[PDB]
Scaffold this active site. Structure first.
Site, PDB file in Angstrom:
ATOM      1  N   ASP A 420      12.515  52.309   5.169  1.00  0.00           N
ATOM      2  CA  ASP A 420      12.817  53.717   4.952  1.00  0.00           C
ATOM      3  C   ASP A 420      12.239  54.549   6.085  1.00  0.00           C
ATOM      4  OD1 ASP A 420      12.667  56.534   3.772  1.00  0.00           O
ATOM      5  OD2 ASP A 420      13.628  55.455   2.121  1.00  0.00           O
ATOM      6  N   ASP A 489      20.347  58.642   0.919  1.00  0.00           N
ATOM      7  CA  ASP A 489      20.108  59.958   0.336  1.00  0.00           C
ATOM      8  C   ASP A 489      21.313  60.896   0.448  1.00  0.00           C
ATOM      9  OD1 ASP A 489      17.631  59.234  -0.544  1.00  0.00           O
ATOM     10  OD2 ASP A 489      16.523  60.249   1.056  1.00  0.00           O
TER      11      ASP A 489
END
Length: 658
Positions: A420, A489
């Site tokens: 991430d 996201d």
């Protein structure tokens, strides 16, 4: 002067120096591009437009990059600059609708300076009122630029978008424009990362897609190769183009994971530890395990806040007061409750105030002025969270990554990792590293990913590896070393659904893809065939809804089904649709809340992909209602009215219903 390998037909005109593209359907051909120029270099701020045709030779049976096929060469000369251009086009019989392009330039008179190289310009044909485009991107605004955009042809303005691939942009180097009849996809052909531009431009009455590479000084009497690209002419939408691109690049050594080697723990439902934010404790996660076990969750992941500094990757004493004992205790509790454990991770980071930088400055990337460089956000900015980058050609960085992987997998106890918050690698100017070019650091993130995945596999054959290039399309050269893909996201539901379709196209039908957890869209997660995951600590009516949809997902199992996306077209069909096949029974998902593309009225629903000689009963499984019955597979048209969604399946019946 034309060639036609499979599903395409490329024609060249000697008088006008134009290239026309076709696509084969039925027994005939369909025009897909108006006559377009070949393209040339940018000398002195202007593209050279003085090229004159010399000769064209066509070879009917040759073996090339992608195997047997055809090839023809175009040679042109420029008098103002003295350059000589050679254009090579290649097609293959096995692959459907893929064209290979190669360019070479020779300077015969004197030195020529080129600031940019341009090739493979194509303009869409047959556009009526709108064009939908797929953008590889990499530099766009983080969380608010859709990877699929609409080019209205009735607008007063114009739509332009330059999809870059550079030190501040790492994504798939592919762009696609399509209409109802079909589309054209252009993408890079390189087994390793480099610098490539994929611009999308709106013309007076159509749109253009192009390929471009940086240039350098061409010495007299020297032959230089610029770059190579793939052209995909396909029927339908971006799914077909991305699938063709993946099939084409399978011939250059970039091979995606096979469906028979994906661990069974990838499809399991997951629960993030974001419920309490940064104030999570081990006891809370331990005490929340029973309810998730009863519901059906089979995977627990540990998010941000467990470490002291990036690079060192030591346990935070606040969260783990007793050391590795606490981590072992948490892992043992998770395993006892029948679930696997994952860990948060930022791969290429090395920290700013970490001990790794304090004691070993020499593994980091050096800027032009002799200062350490920081990881860039998409576009070229800097975020306080990110730290100094680690040079892939330094043994210390690889050793540190392997040490962290081994420590997490053999001492604390963990079955996977979550990548991430990383996007790209800056250029390095350290003379000690002996870099051939300053861009060598940017083109070698795949080495870090490969080494980490090799260590993970060596510790355990069944591992979880996921990378979130959160906000932008995920890095293409990190794909072969993953087992699951997220949507990075997404801001809106249409974004995550379209990205799920695109990643299924790039990866494969059976590859596990999740719909993320930014907002509650259980309907879209189940309908598209994705993996349902949650982050929150739910209590009450929403808790009951969470358990209900977990039960539905457990009883349907669409995450292990086969994704079909070539039947329908996005933006030229009455509804936004997704088809999943599971054990013979076909599943459908129709949507209307896609604010980007929503219809007026209540158009008829047509189910395609069913057996013509079978009788089907259409029943919704969310509410257990028979919407239609006695529907033969050929017609398969029924009229119904719904607000947002409609999930159905085709249950075969041997005799007509009463």
């Amino acid at each position: 002067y034309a060639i036609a390998g499979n599903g395409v037909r490329v024609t060249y005109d000697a008088d006008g120096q134009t290239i026309t593209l076709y696509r084969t359907e039925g027994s005939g051909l369909i025009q897909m591009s108006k006559p377009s120029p070949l393209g040339g270099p940018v000398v002195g701020g202007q593209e050279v437009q003085d090229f004159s045709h010399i000769s064209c030779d066509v070879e009917q049976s040759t073996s090339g990059v992608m195997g047997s096929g055809q090839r023809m060469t175009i040679t042109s000369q420029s008098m103002s600059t003295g350059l000589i251009r050679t254009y090579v086009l290649e097609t293959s019989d096995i692959e459907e609708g893929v064209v290979y392009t190669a360019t070479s330039y020779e300077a015969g008179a004197s030195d020529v300076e080129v600031s940019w190289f341009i090739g493979s310009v194509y303009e869409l044909y047959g556009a009526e009122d709108r064009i939908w485009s797929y953008n590889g991107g990499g530099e766009g605004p983080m969380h608010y630029y859709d990877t699929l955009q609409k080019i209205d042809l009735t607008d007063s303005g114009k739509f332009s978008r330059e999809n870059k691939q550079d030190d501040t942009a790492a994504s798939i180097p592919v762009s696609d424009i399509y209409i109802a009849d079909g589309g054209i996809t252009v993408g890079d052909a390189s087994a390793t990362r480099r610098e490539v531009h994929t611009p999308v431009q709106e013309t007076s009455d159509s749109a253009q897609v192009s390929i471009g590479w940086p240039g350098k000084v061409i010495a007299a009497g020297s032959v230089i190769e610029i770059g190579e690209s793939f052209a995909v002419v396909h029927p339908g939408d971006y799914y077909n183009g991305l699938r063709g691109y993946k099939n084409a690049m399978d011939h250059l050594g970039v091979i995606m994971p096979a469906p028979g080697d994906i661990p069974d723990s990838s499809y399991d439902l997951r629960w993030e530890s974001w419920g309490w934010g940064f104030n999570w404790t081990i006891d809370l996660i331990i005490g929340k395990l029973d309810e998730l076990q009863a519901a059906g969750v089979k995977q627990i992941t540990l998010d941000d806040g467990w470490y002291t500094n990036a690079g060192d990757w030591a346990l935070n004493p606040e969260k783990f007061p007793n050391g590795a004992s606490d981590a072992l205790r948490l892992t043992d509790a998770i395993h006892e409750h029948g679930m696997t454990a994952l860990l948060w991770w930022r791969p290429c980071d090395g920290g700013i105030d970490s001990i790794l930088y304090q004691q070993h400055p020499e593994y980091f990337v050096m800027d032009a002025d002799g200062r350490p460089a920081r990881l860039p956000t998409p576009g070229g900015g800097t975020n306080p969270s990110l730290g100094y980058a680690l040079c892939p050609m330094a043994d210390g960085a690889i050793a540190s990554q392997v040490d962290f992987v081994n420590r997490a997998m053999n001492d604390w106890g963990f079955d996977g990792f979550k990548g991430d918050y990383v996007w790209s690698m800056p250029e390095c100017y350290n003379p000690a590293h002996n870099h051939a070019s300053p861009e060598e650091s940017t083109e070698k993130q795949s080495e870090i990913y490969r080494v980490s995945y090799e260590a993970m596999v060596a510790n355990d054959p069944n591992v979880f590896n996921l990378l979130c290039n959160c906000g932008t399309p995920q890095d293409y050269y990190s794909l072969p070393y993953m087992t699951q893909i997220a949507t990075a996201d997404p801001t809106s539901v249409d974004q995550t659904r379209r990205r799920v379709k695109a990643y299924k196209a790039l990866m494969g039908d059976y590859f596990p893809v999740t719909a993320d957890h930014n907002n509650i869209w259980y309907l879209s997660a189940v309908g598209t065939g994705s993996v349902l995951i949650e982050k929150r600590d739910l209590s009450g009516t929403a808790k009951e809804e969470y358990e209900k949809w977990l039960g539905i997902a457990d009883t349907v199992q669409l995450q292990k089904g086969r994704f079909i996306g070539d039947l329908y077209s996005y933006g030229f069909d009455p509804y936004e649709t997704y088809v999943v096949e599971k054990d013979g029974v076909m599943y459908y998902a129709f949507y209307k809340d896609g604010s980007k593309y929503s219809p007026t009225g209540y158009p008829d629903i047509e189910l395609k992909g069913l057996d013509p000689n079978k009788m089907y009963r259409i029943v919704d499984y969310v509410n257990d209602r028979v919407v239609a019955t006695n529907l033969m597979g050929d017609n398969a048209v029924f009229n119904t009215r719904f607000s947002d969604y409609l999930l159905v399946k085709a249950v075969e019946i041997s005799e007509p219903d009463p």
